[PDB]
């Protein structure tokens, strides 16, 4: 299990490695614009100590930033993401703030939800089971936002200075299936 982010393009350039969590990378590299991960999914983080725009990578090979629908080559901390790699994941979602409102539960994943709940916002939501990434534009574009199980009583919990979520998708971990 291990994420290996390198300063230029194409795996080339200063390379730093990482078996788990870490908090900076930015002394060893001063960009990065490729990445390989292997053996699990990782969230890097534009800023250290876990900060700024967030990008789930799962395990593969991302030869520029617009691989991971990077905005740019600022990145400074990650962590390792603690995924199933089956069973249901469901989710609730919220009008309102504090869990007050309507509440809406899907195992699903929504690439609208305007269209599906009627909702222009997610104001608060409980992780029943799995993991899921929110995302701020319908489709599944747009700003990232990790979610594992646990509850969310306003968007600060998911790291989100907004409620502006438009669309949401399970995650599992991606397995090779060699012969």
């Not at 350039?13 to 969590?21: A, I, K």
């Given at each position: 299990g291990k994420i290996s982010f390198y300063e230029?393009?194409?795996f080339q350039?200063?390379?730093?490695?990482?078996?788990?969590?870490c908090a900076d990378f930015r002394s060893y590299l001063s960009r990065c614009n490729s990445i390989r991960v292997e053996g699990g999914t990782w969230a890097v983080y534009e800023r250290p100590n876990f900060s700024g725009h967030m990008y789930i990578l799962p395990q593969g090979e991302y030869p520029e930033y617009q691989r991971w629908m990077g905005?740019?080559?600022?990145?400074?901390?990650c962590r390792a993401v603690h995924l199933s790699?089956?069973?249901q994941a469901k989710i609730q979602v919220f009008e309102k703030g504090d869990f007050n409102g309507q509440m809406y539960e899907t195992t699903e994943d929504c690439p609208s939800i305007m269209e599906q709940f009627h909702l222009r916002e997610i104001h608060?939501?409980?992780?029943?089971?799995?993991?899921w990434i929110f995302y701020e534009?319908?489709?599944y574009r747009g700003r990232q936002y990790l979610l594992d199980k646990k509850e969310y009583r306003?968007?600060?919990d998911w790291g989100a200075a907004s409620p502006a979520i438009q669309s949401f998708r399970r995650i599992v971990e991606h397995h090779h299936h060699h012969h």
């Open positions: 230029d393009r194409n350039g200063r390379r730093y490695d990482c078996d788990c969590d905005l740019n080559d600022r990145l400074g901390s790699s089956g069973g608060s939501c409980k992780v029943v089971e799995g993991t534009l319908p489709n306003k968007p600060v």
